[PDB]
Amino acid sequence: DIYSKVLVTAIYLALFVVGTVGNGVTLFTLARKKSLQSLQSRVDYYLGSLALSDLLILLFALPVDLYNFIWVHHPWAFGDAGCKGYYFLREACTYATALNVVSLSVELYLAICHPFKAKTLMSRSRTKKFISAIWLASALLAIPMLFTMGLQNLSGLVCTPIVDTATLRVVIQLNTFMSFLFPMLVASILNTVAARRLTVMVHQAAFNMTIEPGRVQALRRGVLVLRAVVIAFVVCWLPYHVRRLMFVYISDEQWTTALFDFYHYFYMLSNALVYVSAAINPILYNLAEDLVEDWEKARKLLEAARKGQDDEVRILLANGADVNTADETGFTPLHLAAWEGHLGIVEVLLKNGADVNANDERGHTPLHLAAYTGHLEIVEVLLKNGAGVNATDVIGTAPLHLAAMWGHLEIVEVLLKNGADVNAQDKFGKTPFDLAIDNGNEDIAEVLQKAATRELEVLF
Ligand SMILES: CC(C)C[C@H](NC(=O)c1cn(S(=O)(=O)c2cccc3cccnc23)c2ccccc12)C(=O)O
């Protein structure tokens, strides 16, 4: 069938031109990147390793494959070296890709399931040496293909196995388990266990009120990406490995003209999907970078708001940084801004739709911190943006309690004006008036007492 090959040629060229350029750009980008952050650099090395392996598959394996294996009528044009080299390089890359793919699964698992251990015990230098081992291990396990494959004349020349069927069955079965089955088994398990561990963390993190930490939200996106990579790897590589197992077992005697025509379709289809796996690789890079960038932007926003770098804050929000980013303890940037007393940074965030009634672990809102600080302008600002006046923490402490306790008469007058419940008291039973007396802020006590008595007059 002439048409079949013409259709395959078009698809191969399509995967070749964009896949080669696609992965080429990824390497060029990473090489010049000069990333300062550890997480960025750590991931980039793996993406580069995947970019390199998948580029080599498209640059060298595909052209040889297309000319001598798809268009079979051509005699072998690459000589004995080209035959042995083709299968060696092809085998080395399959391994490398599979090992890199599962290497992402252990790194995600470690990050999710051993956060304390991983954070401390992960360095850039550790990753470089680890990846070096993968390529070496792959190259070592690829060497056999230099000895198992060679040129035989059936007068034309064909790049065919030169060893006996028994020896051939072993090496490929070894390669199948080592470079696919084992990796994809581990990849699936580690992902599934990490996915379950993550789900607990999300439920543990978010309760009555704690929002959701940005770092968890990053890992929650992480599993979803690798979930796609494993499902993507299996559908693309299973047919290839299954075809190779068919070839070794379906050896001699039964090799009819008809059986080959069938196997040739399998060969076109199975290899096309391998080149698809190489061609979609740059999407994983884009998705990985998009995620890692969003995480860094969010970290920067929390750092900037605390530091009081108003210029930085604006820059980040302009480039779609998450306004409502909780830290480890559930602190939004508005908390940190209001805490440190950056009226400008507070105004900017609220303008970009910052959650005015966000809660931390202790249940503190931004207003609680502004009342503690005593910054009247921010308190006024927050209340204008619809901040809850009678919001209470775990202990039952409210803004009025904090203000009165620490002696901010202007804040106390402001809070009462916005419908603050003077009567409301904490778990210990103390009202603001009781706390004001306890601290001895007599000027404030008089201000509160009059309000309570006014409420009694209003009742009759
Ligand atoms: C198990 C692997 C180490 C070898 C396998 N190669 C083959 O199955 C092929 C081996 N040849 S061939 O050039 O040796 C060949 C050429 C022509 C007729 C053949 C009949 C039976 C077996 N091979 C024949 C192919 C021709 C077209 C498509 C595929 C092949 C592969 O590349 O995956």
Residues 6+ apart with CB under 8 A from 260: none
Phi, psi dihedral angles at 428 (to 5 degrees): -80, -10
Are the C-beta atoms of 323 and 344 separated by less than 8 Å? no
Note the helical H segments in 177-213. 182-205
> Which residue, among 422, 342, 412, 419, has the nearest Cα to 381 in the 3D structure?
342
Phi, psi dihedral angles at 422 (to 5 degrees): -65, -35
Instruction: Give SS3 for 460.
Output: coil
Q: d(Cα 181, Cα 342) in Å, to the nearest integer?
A: 56
Taken in order of first residue, the domains within the chain and their CATH numbers are 2-296 (1.20.1070.10), 329-459 (1.25.40.20)
Residues 6+ apart with CB under 8 A from 286: none
Instruction: Give SS3 for 157.
Output: strand
Could you identify the residue written with the tokens 């401390």? 120
Tokens representing 372?
């503690």
For ligand 1, is residue 90 a contact (CB within 6 Å)? no
Could you identify the residue written with the tokens 């939004």? 332
> Which residue, among 348, 339, 337, has the nearest Cα to 302 in the 3D structure?
337
Note the helical H segments in 206-256. 214-249
Question: Which residue has the least CA distance to atom 19 on ligand 1?
Answer: 260
How far does the centroid of ligand 1 lie from the alpha carbon of residue 185, in Å?
29
Q: Check the chain for breaks (C–N over 2.5 Å) and list the residue before each, or none.
A: 155
- Which residues sit opposite 159 in a β-bridge? 151
- Give 177-180 contacts, CB < 8 A, sequence gap 24+: 178/95, 178/141, 179/91, 179/94, 179/95, 179/98, 179/99, 179/141, 180/94, 180/98, 180/237, 180/238, 180/241
Q: d(Cα 298, Cα 286) in Å, to the nearest integer?
A: 18
Are the C-beta atoms of 278 and 18 separated by less than 8 Å? no
Farthest CA pair distance, the chain: 115
Tokens representing 442?
């007599």
Give the count of beta carbons closer than 10 Å to the beta carbon of residue 261.
11
How far does the centroid of ligand 1 lie from the alpha carbon of residue 260, in Å?
9
| 149 CA: nearest ligand 1 atom | 3
The CA-based dihedral angle spanning residues 92, 228, 234, 139, taken in that order and rounded to the nearest 10 degrees: 10
Residues 6+ apart with CB under 8 A from 433: 404, 422, 445, 448, 449, 452
Question: Which residue has the least CA distance to atom 5 on ligand 1?
Answer: 244
Are the C-beta atoms of 207 and 318 separated by less than 8 Å? no
For ligand 1, is residue 158 a contact (CB within 6 Å)? yes
- Which residues sit opposite 152 in a β-bridge? 158
Q: What is the distance, to the nearest Å, from the Cα of residue 430 to the centroid of all Cα atoms in its chain?
A: 47
| 244 CA: nearest ligand 1 atom | 1
Tokens representing 446?
């008089």
b (16+ CB within 10 A) / e for 158-191? ebebeeeeeebbebbeebbebbbeebbebbbebb
Instruction: Give SS3 for 314.
Output: helix
Q: What is the distance, to the nearest Å, from the Cα of residue 435 to the centroid of all Cα atoms in its chain?
A: 48
For ligand 1, is residue 247 a contact (CB within 6 Å)? yes
Could you identify the residue written with the tokens 């580690």? 190
Please give the single-letter amino acid code of residue 132: S
> Which residue, among 138, 125, 124, has the nearest Cα to 53 in the 3D structure?
138
Could you identify the residue written with the tokens 């060696």? 88
How far does the centroid of ligand 1 lie from the alpha carbon of residue 160, in Å?
6
Q: d(Cα 65, Cα 5) in Å, to the nearest integer?
A: 12
- Which residues sit opposite 157 in a β-bridge? 153
Q: d(Cα 48, Cα 147) in Å, to the nearest integer?
A: 30
275 sits in which H/E element: helix 257-279
Q: What separation in angstroms does the CA of 277 have from each of 31, 110, 187, 283, 453?
A: 23, 26, 16, 10, 76
Q: d(Cα 420, Cα 401) in Å, to the nearest integer?
A: 10
Resolution in A: 2.8
Pocket mutation for ligand 1, best pick of 64, 240, 267, 275 (most atoms within 8 Å of C-beta): 267
> Which residue, among 81, 40, 38, 90, has the nearest Cα to 61 in the 3D structure?
90
